[PDB]
Amino acid sequence: VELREAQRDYLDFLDDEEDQGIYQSKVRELISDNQYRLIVNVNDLRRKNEKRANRLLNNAFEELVAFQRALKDFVASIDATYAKQYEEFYVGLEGSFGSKHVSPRTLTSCFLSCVVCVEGIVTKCSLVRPKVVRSVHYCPATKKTIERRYPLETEYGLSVYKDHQTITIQEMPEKAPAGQLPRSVDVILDDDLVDKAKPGDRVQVVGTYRCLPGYTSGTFRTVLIACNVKQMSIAKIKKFSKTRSKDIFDQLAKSLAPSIHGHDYVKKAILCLLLGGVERDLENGSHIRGDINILLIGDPSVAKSQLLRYVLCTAPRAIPTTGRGSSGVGLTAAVTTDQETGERRLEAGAMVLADRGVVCIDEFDKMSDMDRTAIHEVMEQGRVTIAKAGIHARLNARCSVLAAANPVYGRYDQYKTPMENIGLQDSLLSRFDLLFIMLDQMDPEQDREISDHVLRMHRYRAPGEQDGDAMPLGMVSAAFMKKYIHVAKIIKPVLTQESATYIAEEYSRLRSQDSMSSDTARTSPVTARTLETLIRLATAHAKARMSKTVDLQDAEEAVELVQYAYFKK
């Protein structure tokens, strides 16, 4: 009956006030926040008692129950009244697990009853619903009662229930072996862990791998009973922004996507898309769109696809899509039959999952127009209306669209106007904020530096790799860039009278010039949407400075950008 000594070990481990008192402090915090689970770091346990630590990982169940009882006794010794508020306490684990860190592919039947640490990408969820643990019945005519664990009438207030949910984890597709589809596993979430993860999240789950029963065919289904769930995704920024020696926005734009050479204005516009504008609301109930949309058109081999694959790696909550490989149902939402409950419910599509994020559409000119009808409502209003599976609803799909396409006839024709080369409808072309045209002008002076840069890139080898190796199948630093952009997304700067005056006067001047100009010399007409674009771009530039005001410099930069985009051949 050594488990009574094992519980005794855990209780004297938890009583660490004699040695710097970290865990007693954590338990005190748990009490103050009215909580009922604790998170223990396995490194500390391994340091204090090697035998107990190395036994815990290979006997998850029999050891964790002893640990839970030790915690219950310790909190009761601190405060019995608090200990009586909850039926039982729980403990979760963190740290380094060594050999027990696995994936949904490498996890096999020999891991049963070990503590395991699985990681992958979440693909689906069931709905939260209650489960019974103890039921009670009472008789008022006799003052009598009975109980059961898992005449008289049921006592819902003396009975007690707890929450239950199921989710599914999938292997990272980048790590799949050659020529095979990804594998997956089912995770069970219970009590205070429900709804801590949603589809598209990258998670790392700690739990115990276990069979479920099922005459018998001698065959079982295996599930991971979760024990903890984890997610993954100042002075430096202060002194850097305080310098004011140079236009910081130009330096950040120059440093964007170092592999790709040229295309200055495109990089500046993409940085404005990453920073975004700001929303505003009016007393009549109307509101102004804060997010930005961008379109790219051009010849073969001008790095259009690579810029999309870069933004997708350097922005939070970003999604890919290709014109030929996707459907309107897949873009918005699809009805699904739940196998846990049997019920019919909706499942999110690509543009819904990109809410408060970015969505990249490659090969945009190959979509059927019926899909573009779905994209129209999303890009204009940020909402999507659905009328299926007994639900009439207005879902949230607020996102910035970055899209790329190739011109009609494959190679752009100099002897035709922009509206002739571009294959899209004039209604749709009016929705994007900025439209860029890119061309492979075969100048030898430019080919010299381009070819040199490409060849420099192909001779590199990483410092952690040796002279002849080959990989298996399966300027500002990037880290600072991410942190600076992340802080800059809070500032919410405001207009100034001078910037407003400048924008108004300059817009009137631009309108007069456009009135003089002809469709043979412009991509699209200029209207109030131009003012909205100018305001968004000036706001974003002020945001990059972290200046609380929108200044004349921001407005001047914004108008120069749109001037280049609209009034160059």
């Binding site: 597709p173 980048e174 799949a176 050659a178 020529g179 095979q180 589809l181 996507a257 170092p258 592999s259 073969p300 081999s301 696809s305 690579q306 694959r309 870069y310 890919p320 899509t321 290709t322 030929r324 490989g325 996707s326 459907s327 149902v329 897949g330 699809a334 699904t336 039959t337 196998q339 499942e347 599509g349 690509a350 999952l353 490659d362 090969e363 190959k366 494959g410 190679r411 492979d440 075969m442 030898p444 010299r448 381009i450 070819s451 040199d452 490409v454 060849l455 890139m457 192909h458 001779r459 590199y460 080898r461 990483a462 002279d467 002849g468 190796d469 080959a470 990989m471 199948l473 990037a478």
Partner: protein, 381 residues
């Protein structure tokens, strides 16, 4: 029906040819099903033994290995030595790279053959499918977009939607042979533009969104618009659009020729090939297959500095010439010269270096790489 247990799990995948040893047993009123309990598995076709490594090291060491390999490729087909050399480079491939800012470069090589009927195009495809460690052969006329890349369909059990892999997924890491290439529909050739360059397939259907891998080579065969090449009509023999012609590393034009000496030689070669079917009773196909797999997994080259300098200076001349030809002409050409061609020559230089297990490519290798590209794409342009 087969049952598999303990150490035999995940030893095979579908499409493989295998030999099985097991127990045979049972699982209208009188019907019962039956199946086999497996006790041993042998893949009719493993880690290389030390002896095998010594032989592969010897093959890599000996000095004229390039010609030896060239003669092993499709040995029955008369002539076409340059075409066989290009096929060798396709099988070995360049090298994959991941750059410091996280972007990728594809490494592997795409090849196209276009021209006259009766010139053994289909035979070469039929050989390369057997010579490669991983390979698949399909017809352009008999295939669909959802069949080439990937598909979505409802599970025959349960009620859920499930994913399925097409030809370009099954051949991940190997070669895909597309025969009758000029007889696909336009909207179906559009479907492989992501797979041929970015080597991944992006799907968004039925409430599921994922990205799949396809790291494979494309080898294709086609005719002129007019059935055989008509030199009086020039560029009109080709009607593929520029956005796909630019995704091939090399393009070959094959024309039939009526020289008497070659005809007599070829006739004798054909007749003795037929006659020697009974009488029959340099590297073999099996040996070459294992050698290719070994070289691909162990060796990854890079350019020497001077080799990159030489290639740079050549590329400027090449771009200038192409620009002047289009400027002089009243018409724009179908086969462009772009940065993709600069990368193409580098991939061939790495392949040539890989055959000899050498860590660096050299000016000799760049010279041969430029020669191969000079013949094919500049004859086509």
């Amino acid at each position: 029906q087969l049952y598999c247990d303990r150490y035999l799990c995940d030893k095979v995948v579908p499409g493989n040819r295998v030999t099985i040893m097991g127990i045979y047993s049972i699982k209208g009123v009188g019907i019962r099903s039956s199946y086999i309990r497996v006790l041993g598995i042998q893949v009719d076709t493993g880690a290389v033994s030390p002896q095998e490594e010594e032989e592969f090291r010897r093959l890599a060491a000996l000095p004229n290995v390039y010609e030896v390999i060239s003669k092993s490729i499709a040995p029955s087909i008369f002539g076409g030595t340059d075409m066989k050399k290009a096929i060798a480079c396709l099988l070995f491939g360049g090298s994959r790279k991941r750059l410091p800012d996280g972007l990728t470069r594809r490494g592997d090589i795409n090849l196209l053959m276009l021209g006259d009927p009766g010139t053994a195009k289909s035979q070469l495809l039929k050989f390369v499918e057997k010579c490669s460690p991983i390979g698949v052969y399909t017809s352009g006329k008999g295939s669909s977009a959802a069949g080439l890349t990937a598909s979505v369909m409802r599970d025959p059990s349960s009620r859920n939607f499930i994913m399925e892999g097409g030809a370009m997924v099954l051949a991940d890491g190997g070669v895909v042979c597309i025969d009758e290439f000029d007889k696909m529909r336009e909207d179906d050739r559009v479907a492989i533009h992501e797979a041929m360059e970015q080597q991944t397939i992006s799907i968004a259907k039925a409430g599921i969104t994922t990205t799949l891998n396809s790291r494979c080579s494309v080898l294709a065969a086609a005719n002129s618009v007019f059935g055989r090449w008509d030199e009086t009509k020039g560029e009109d023999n080709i009607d593929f659009m520029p956005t796909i012609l630019s995704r091939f590393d090399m393009i070959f034009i094959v024309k039939d020729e009526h020289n008497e000496e070659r005809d007599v030689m070829l006739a004798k070669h054909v007749i003795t090939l037929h006659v020697s079917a009974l009488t029959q009773t340099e590297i073999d196909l099996a040996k070459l297959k294992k050698f290719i797999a070994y070289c691909r997994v162990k060796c990854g080259p890079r350019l020497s500095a001077e080799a990159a300098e030489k290639l740079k200076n050549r590329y400027i001349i090449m771009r200038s010439g192409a620009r002047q030809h289009e400027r002089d002409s009243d018409r724009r050409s179908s086969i462009p010269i772009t940065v993709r061609q600069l990368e193409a020559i580098v991939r061939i230089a790495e392949a040539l270096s890989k055959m000899k297990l050498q860590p660096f490519a050299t000016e000799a290798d760049v010279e041969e790489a430029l020669r191969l590209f000079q013949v094919s794409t500049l004859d086509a342009a």
